[PDB]
Design a protein around this ligand. Sequence first.
Ligand SMILES: Cn1cc(C#CCn2cnc3c(c(/C=C/S(N)(=O)=O)cn3CC(=O)Nc3ccncc3Cl)c2=O)cn1
Ligand SMILES: Cn1cc(C#CCn2cnc3c(c(/C=C/S(N)(=O)=O)cn3CC(=O)Nc3ccncc3Cl)c2=O)cn1
Ligand SMILES: [Cl-]
Ligand SMILES: [Cl-]
Lengths: 122, 122
Amino acid sequence: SQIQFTRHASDVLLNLNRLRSRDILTDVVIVVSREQFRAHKTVLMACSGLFYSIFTDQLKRNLSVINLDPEINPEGFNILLDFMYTSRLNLREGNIMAVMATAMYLQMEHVVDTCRKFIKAS
Amino acid sequence: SQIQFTRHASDVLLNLNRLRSRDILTDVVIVVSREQFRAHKTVLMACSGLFYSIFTDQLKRNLSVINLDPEINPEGFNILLDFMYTSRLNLREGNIMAVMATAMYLQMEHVVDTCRKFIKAS
Ligand SMILES: Cn1cc(C#CCn2cnc3c(c(/C=C/S(N)(=O)=O)cn3CC(=O)Nc3ccncc3Cl)c2=O)cn1
Ligand SMILES: Cn1cc(C#CCn2cnc3c(c(/C=C/S(N)(=O)=O)cn3CC(=O)Nc3ccncc3Cl)c2=O)cn1
Ligand SMILES: [Cl-]
Ligand SMILES: [Cl-]
């Protein structure tokens, strides 16, 4: 029935990423060892079972700082956060294992499955 | 270079819409005459020049209630808000003029242009 705008979802995500680049309406800092990364909780929830579980919980929804497991690699996390905001996943032989283990921790099954495909094709 | 996830932007927007349906992390009420509609400021900014201009402004960024022009038709606004969260625009002969005038007010040029195409094809 309704008219479908094929580029609209991509346009929305690009503009969310532009807001993240300007720190506009970002509402959380994710701390990963010595690094930290600002984001929108809504985008994190949309992209991660871990962040969904954290922020749906009424005890945690209002947190402004989330400390990740100190074993998580900041580069693997940064790669996945950039994927969340762009639809683009930079998998390479040098980062595949860190990215895949981080995607398991963040509960991102389709990314984990793509990492398995990458390993199988290598 | 990077791996492109074709469904990712659509997945993000669907999950933002699911959060809006549960009123999770919505941060504004838009008042349109006797009706009101909750939303995420980030999605409104991504989809509307009017909301972009309102919430980028440091005097207005923290507002939790925005009163629209009392001449705006609530049904036309609801149609456009649903489009923002779905990529689907329900244009019909009975609503085209209200939708098009509302899209002008919200500063949504590609929607206005699609409304002109609808008129031309009618
Ligand atoms: C150890 N291990 C665990 C897993 C897993 C898992 C399941 N699992 C749960 N949750 C997910 C995802 C994705 C995938 C993204 S991706 N990048 O893979 O395509 C996003 N989310 C959040 C989500 O569904 N959010 C909402 C749902 C309904 N309503 C509102 C919202 Cl916000 C997701 O895989 C993988 N390994
Ligand atoms: C009287 N009259 C005025 C107009 C107009 C206009 C221009 N105009 C300005 N702004 C827009 C749009 C759209 C279109 C959406 S749509 N539905 O038409 O495709 C979205 N936005 C917001 C936006 O660009 N936001 C960001 C930009 C950069 N960085 C971060 C963000 Cl959040 C947009 O058309 C039409 N009639
Ligand atoms: Cl802000
Ligand atoms: Cl909330």
